[PDB]
């Protein structure tokens, strides 16, 4: 699925075919599988800039994630929840989803793909209101510490964010 979506080809059948993946995964009753398929499909609607059903279906996914286990999966959807309220420019719900992902991910050693994205988005939250660029520069600096030597577009946009803030 991820290697099929990174090709960036024929995105019209991708979202419907992903709905056939959630349909098939529910047909064989694989709950965590279709939770992952919604977890990537909501990133597809984030890439499509369709903020209605991404926040709606993602929120209904939060209704079955707040009850269930796998707290690290909640960090993905509260992270991208912060991405979609920031993309809609809503600061308190982005700070609340951010802080909820922080107090969810405080016990879990996250991968630096997920661990650094908290502070990467957090610097855009604080320097979105431009409260303190010392703290925000700490967020893009530690974000650069997370994206160092793992991905070169992410690194050049990381130093773009350091020189930016």
């Amino acid at each position: 699925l991820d290697l099929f979506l990174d090709m960036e080809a024929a995105t019209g059948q991708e979202v419907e075919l992903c709905l056939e993946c959630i349909e098939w995964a529910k047909s064989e009753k694989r709950t965590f599988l279709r939770q992952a398929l919604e977890a990537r499909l909501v990133s597809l609607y984030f890439d499509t800039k369709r903020y209605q059903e991404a926040l709606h279906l993602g929120s209904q996914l939060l209704r079955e994630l707040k009850k269930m286990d796998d707290k690290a999966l909640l960090v993905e959807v509260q992270l991208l929840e912060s991405k979609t309220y920031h993309a809609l420019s809503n600061l308190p719900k982005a700070r609340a989803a951010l802080t909820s992902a922080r107090t969810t991910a405080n016990a879990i050693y996250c991968p630096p793909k997920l661990q650094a994205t908290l502070d990467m988005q957090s610097g855009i939250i604080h320097a979105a209101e431009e409260k303190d660029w010392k703290t925000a520069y700490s967020y893009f600096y530690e974000a650069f510490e997370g994206y160092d030597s793992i991905d070169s577009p992410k690194a050049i946009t990381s130093l773009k964010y350091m020189l930016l803030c």
């Binding site: 993309a87 420019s89 855009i124 320097a127 431009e130 930016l164």
Partner: protein, 55 residues
């Protein structure tokens, strides 16, 4: 900068803030002055300058 993120607004506020420092620099000694004497310093049109000033 066409693939620039939402922070283009922050870059534009940096531009307009340096414009503000320009305006509070050159206008500040001047009670009454020509608009092209004072825009000839910055060699820019008076339209957007008039809009930002009057704004």
């Amino acid at each position: 900068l066409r693939d620039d993120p939402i922070i283009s607004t922050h870059l534009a506020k940096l531009y307009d803030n340096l414009l503000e420092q320009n305006l509070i620099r050159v206008i500040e000694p001047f009670s009454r002055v020509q608009i092209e004497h004072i825009s000839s310093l910055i060699k820019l049109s008076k339209a957007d300058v008039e809009r930002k000033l009057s704004q």
